[PDB]
Ligand binder design. Structure first.
Ligand SMILES: Cc1ccsc1CNC(C)(C)CO
Length: 460
């Protein structure tokens, strides 16, 4: 049985509004309804991995797992295996995989983050799962962020607390948060961003939804506008939205949006909004293609409609040469030429680099760079040709060209990272000086840039 070089992944997010689901929820897993939907001819073809995020979930883990497994078995005639399940309050994540993947999946991690202090600690936060699929690391985050049209800044703060404090992936990657730990990271949930239009325009918004004219609404979607101004989800992707707002509906129909202020809403309006989202972030030059992104039309127990997204995701095999793992492959080397970091920091300490990658036996520390002043105020840390030669565990180009090098720039004084980024080894050529670039972030905010040249030697 050959190892796959591609898998498909289902992402579901549903805020269940504290109500049990209806007897049939198959439309969700079939990506049927509104938006970018899945072709009928694929209905019997199982996804490799299903990841289900719920919010306001009133079920026990046992009750929900039974409903999910029964639904997938009805669709596919496959009995899926439970990879992981984790619940914080009424926020839950389930990961199911085809039984043929049981031995391909390892290093399963789960964690949660509670957002807010005192008043604002008690029901919002995130749960997450990570694991290895052969040679590929996968991470999944389900978050229920702060509610209310006038709290987009709070939502952005919730986002930063979740990416800092969610402990998934390889703990040896100590300078790196979840936005750098995975080949593919999917972040979904009731993110609770709203269409920021005046309250008086509610009936106008409903009219536009009835006409399937979403352009004037999406131009006011707080997640799109905050992302465009680099306030949140920096370096994440989202498929184009072509489905109606998924909140806030009257239950038992989809014909009516319930937007007017009520005692039950804390006297807040809920203008129709795209609260329920799926975003992703993959390492550079890895195959990731969104194949569906939409909402169901026929599941009406909640004031939200379920959202689905599906992806093709590139995966690599667990590589074994005569040499690595457990030694170097003296034929392989990675060289950095003329490299420098441009940092936004006002501080003046010395900096060094750490290189982390699963193609190295352990991370590599550089010597300190030489600081200079950029022409527009910046700190430029020059490394020249002083960076160590990296010795990969395997030199075979079918392995090495698929790998990635994580870079952290650290203060000599404090050993704290000022910036993290990632460089693909999927080069246009080997034994050739080629430009490399990554932005640098810390706590998922832009802090600088790393650029220079690379020279990769493989056994070929
Ligand atoms: C968030 C947003 C809105 C318009 S462009 C943009 C940035 N998205 C990218 C990074 C995929 C394009 O380079």
């Amino acid at each position: 049985q050959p190892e796959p070089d591609m898998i498909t992944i289902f992402i579901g997010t549903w805020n269940m509004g504290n109500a049990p689901p209806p007897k049939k929820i198959t439309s969700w897993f079939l990506s049927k309804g509104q938006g970018k939907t899945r072709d009928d001819s694929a209905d019997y073809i199982p996804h490799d991995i299903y990841v289900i995020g719920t919010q306001e979930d009133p079920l026990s883990e046992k009750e929900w797992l039974e409903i999910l497994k029964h639904s997938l078995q009805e669709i596919t005639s496959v009995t899926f295996k439970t990879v992981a399940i984790h619940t914080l309050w009424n926020i839950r994540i389930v990961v199911l995989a085809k039984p043929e993947h049981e031995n391909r999946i390892s290093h399963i991690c789960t964690d949660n983050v509670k957002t807010g202090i005192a008043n604002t600690l008690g029901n919002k936060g995130a749960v997450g799962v990570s694991f290895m699929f052969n040679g590929t690391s996968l991470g999944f985050v389900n978050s229920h962020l702060t509610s209310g049209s006038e709290k987009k800044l709070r939502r952005n703060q919730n986002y930063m607390n979740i990416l800092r404090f969610l402990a998934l992936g390889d703990k040896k990657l100590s300078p790196f948060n979840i936005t750098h730990r995975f080949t593919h990271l999917f972040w979904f949930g009731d993110l609770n961003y709203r269409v920021d239009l005046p309250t008086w325009e509610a009936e106008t918004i409903i009219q536009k939804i009835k006409q399937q004219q979403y352009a004037d609404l999406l131009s006011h979607d707080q997640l799109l506008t905050e992302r465009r101004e680099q306030k949140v989800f920096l370096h994440f992707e989202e498929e184009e939205i072509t489905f109606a707002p998924t909140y806030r509906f009257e239950r038992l129909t989809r014909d009516k949006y319930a937007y007017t202020k009520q005692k039950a809403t804390g006297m807040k309006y809920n203008l129709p909004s795209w609260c329920d989202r799926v975003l992703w972030k993959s390492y550079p030059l890895v195959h990731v293609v969104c194949q569906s992104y939409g909402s169901t039309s026929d599941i009406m127990t909640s004031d939200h409609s379920p959202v689905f997204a599906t992806f093709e995701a590139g995966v690599t095999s667990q590589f074994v040469s005569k040499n690595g793992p457990g030694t170097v492959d003296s034929q392989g080397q990675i060289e950095f030429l003329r490299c420098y970091a441009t940092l936004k920091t006002k501080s003046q300490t010395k900096f060094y680099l750490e290189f982390h990658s699963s193609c190295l036996e352990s991370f590599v520390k550089s010597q300190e760079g030489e600081n200079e002043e950029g022409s527009e105020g910046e700190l430029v840390v020059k490394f020249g040709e002083t960076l160590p030669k990296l010795k990969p565990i395997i030199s075979d180009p079918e392995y090495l060209l698929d790998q990635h090098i994580l870079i952290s720039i650290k203060s000599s004084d404090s050993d704290e990272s000022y910036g993290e980024g990632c460089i693909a080894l999927r080069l246009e050529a080997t034994e050739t000086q080629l430009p490399i670039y990554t932005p640098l972030t810390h706590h998922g905010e832009l802090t600088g840039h790393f650029q220079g040249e690379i020279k990769l030697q493989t056994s070929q």
